Amino acid sequence: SPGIWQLDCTHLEGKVILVAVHVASGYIEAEVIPAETGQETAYFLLKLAGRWPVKTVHTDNGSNFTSTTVKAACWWAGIKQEDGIPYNPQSQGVIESMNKELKKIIGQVRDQAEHLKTAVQMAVFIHNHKRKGYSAGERIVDIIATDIQ
Amino acid sequence: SPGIWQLDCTHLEGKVILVAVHVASGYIEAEVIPAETGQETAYFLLKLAGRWPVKTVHTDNGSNFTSTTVKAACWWAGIKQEDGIPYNPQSQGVIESMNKELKKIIGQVRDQAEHLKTAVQMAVFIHNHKRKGYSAGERIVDIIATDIQ
Ligand SMILES: O=C(O)c1ccccc1CN1C(=O)Cc2ccccc21
Ligand SMILES: O=C(O)c1ccccc1CN1C(=O)Cc2ccccc21
Ligand SMILES: [Cl-]
Known part of the structure; x- marks a missing residue:
């Protein structure tokens, strides 16, 4: 469970934003790619x-x-690849909500950066530091440290 | 001390490898850039x-x-920018050694990837997971979790 991540792909300005969410914490990493x-x-x-x-x-x-290239990467990195089928139906709506939230944050910072990629990283920063009183950044570290001990 | 990072720039195949090292743990992140x-x-x-x-x-x-762009980024992200002048002379040789080690790992994986950037990320993986019996990846999480509590 401390090792579970979910991939998510969303679109903005004719580009693709690839997101990985640490399920237990809500912590994210993201990148902009052409497709x-x-x-x-x-x-x-x-x-x-x-x-x-x-x-x-x-x-x-x-x-x-x-994807054979994806399977090779998961093999290389010791990652167990699974489907993301929302066996809990809540799961899809949660992702949708995260995408809406990320796009909201991107909009709030969009004018402070020329390139979309910069705005996305600013949004990752804001998302991960936001207090909800722990932050996602604090939760992921706590979850994994507990697991190491 | 759990918040201290050191920037490091090194060269390979006519490209630049930018590295950030978490000083207390030896954990790294890296990227390839043209310059x-x-x-x-x-x-x-x-x-x-x-x-x-x-x-x-x-x-x-x-x-x-x-760099005014660097200073703006540090302001934005709440980062205190400092010089990296090795007031402890131990410090420069340590970086040199890290660059030599990273380049060694890059050489060991280089043939498994077409693009240098892929090889660099594989080397980051190997470096951060290497048991020294804790790994850098384990040390950084422990250091910061302890600091949160
Ligand atoms: O405009 C951009 O996309 C971009 C790309 C790379 C670095 C910085 C920026 C923009 N930018 C600055 O110039 C100052 C600054 C502070 C914080 C975030 C982004 C920027
Ligand atoms: O060859 C590359 O540089 C590159 C770039 C992006 C993705 C995968 C690769 C190479 N590669 C594979 O095709 C299989 C694989 C497993 C693990 C790491 C890299 C690769
Ligand atoms: Cl696509």
């Missing part, structure tokens, strides 16, 4: 897994689930 | 600070120390 390909998704997971102890990834769609 | 500019460095710090609680950054050289 969702197996190679981009594989590279993103490789980055994620070098930064956080990723055990399981729920993929965002069947193309990334099937 | 070290204020804008690239600023973006890299924005990414870092949205992912980890960055309080202080020792910059890697005087150009990044002076």
Whole structure:
């Protein structure tokens, strides 16, 4: 459970925003890419897994689930690849809500940056530091530290 | 001390590898860029600070120390920008050693990837997971979780 992440893909300004959410904490990492390909998704997971102890990834769609490049990256990084089928139906609406929230934050910072990618990273910052009184950033560290001990 | 990071820039295949090291743990994040500019460095710090609680950054050289774009990014992200002058002389040789080690790991994986950026991320993975018996990845989480409590 401290090792579970969910992939999520959303669109803005004719570009793709790839998101990984740490399910237990709500902590996210994100990147802007021209389009969702197996190679981009594989590279993103490789980055994620070098930064956080990723055990399981729920993929965002069947193309990334099937992608041989994605499967190779998960093998390389010791990640168990799974489907992201909302067996809990709450799950899809939660993602939708996260995408709406992220896009809201992007809109609030959009004018402070020329390039979308910069605005996305600012939104990641704001999302992860937001107090809700712990932040997502604090929760993920606490969850994983507890798990290490 | 749990909030202190050090910037480091090194070169390979005619490209630049930008590294941030969490001083207390030895944990790293890295990226490949065409060349070290204020804008690239600023973006890299924005990414870092949205992912980890960055309080202080020792910059890697005087150009990044002076850069108005870097200073703006540190202001935005609540980061105290400092010089990286090795007042402890131990410090410069430690960086050198890290660069040598990273390049060694890059060489060991280089043939498994077409693009240098992929090899760099694989090396970050290997570096952060290496048992030394805790890993850098485990140490950074422990250090910061302890600090939160
Ligand atoms: O405008 C951009 O997209 C961009 C790209 C790379 C670095 C900085 C920026 C924009 N920017 C500044 O110039 C100052 C600044 C502070 C904080 C965030 C972004 C920026
Ligand atoms: O060759 C590359 O640079 C590159 C770029 C993006 C994604 C995957 C790769 C290479 N690669 C695969 O195709 C399989 C694989 C597993 C693990 C890491 C990289 C790769
Ligand atoms: Cl797409």
